[PDB]
Amino acid sequence: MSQATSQPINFQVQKDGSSEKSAMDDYMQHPGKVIKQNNKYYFQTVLNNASFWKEYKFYNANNQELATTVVNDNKKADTRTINVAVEPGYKSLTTKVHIVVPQINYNHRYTTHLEFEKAIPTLA
Numbered sequence: 001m002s003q004a005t006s007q008p009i010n011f012q013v014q015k016d017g018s019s020e021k022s023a024m025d026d027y028m029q030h031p032g033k034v035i036k037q038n039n040k041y042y043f044q045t046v047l048n049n050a051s052f053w054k055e056y057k058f059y060n061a062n063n064q065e066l067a068t069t070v071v072n073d074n075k076k077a078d079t080r081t082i083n084v085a086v087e088p089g090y091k092s093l094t095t096k097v098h099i100v101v102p103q104i105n106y107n108h109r110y111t112t113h114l115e116f117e118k119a120i121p122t123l124a
């Protein structure tokens with residue numbers, strides 16, 4: 001027996017070292033989703049142009065690692081739905097991404113910070 005609850009949560013990805021919107025925000029669907037499944041919380045988000053996202057790690061503001069799983073690597077849509085393990089009360093994630101766009105020889109590693117519109121809630 002398991003139980004799951006979800007609700008939308010919006011967010012903005014911002015540039016390393018500022019609050020300016022990052023280019024990364026344009027490559028993710030909005031809003032995302034908070035899921036609670038058997039008293040574990042996840043932030044679920046969808047990566048657009050998924051083939052460009054070669055690596056993506058998430059951390060909390062204290063540098064703890066946040067396990068990231070892939071729900072659906074949708075090759076037909078070129079999207080990727082991922083779950084990031086979070087805790088209620090988190091307000092922002094640090095992300096470290098490796099983006100590769102082979103046809104323009106673009107191969108970059110970035111740090112950004114993903115700011116939730118409001119802290120991750122407790123769900124019933």
Ligand code: HEM
Nearest residue numbers: 014015016021022023024027049052053099101104110112
């Ligand atoms: C998954 C796709 C992509 C992601 C996640 C992404 C993310 C980023 C990030 C995080 C930065 C650092 C500045 C910022 O935070 O906004 C950046 C820089 C940049 N990227 Fe990308 N990008 C993507 C695709 C592309 C593509 C397809 C191009 C085409 C050229 C591109 C061109 C650039 C340019 C021009 C900059 C800034 C260079 C400068 O500051 O002078 N990016 N990108």
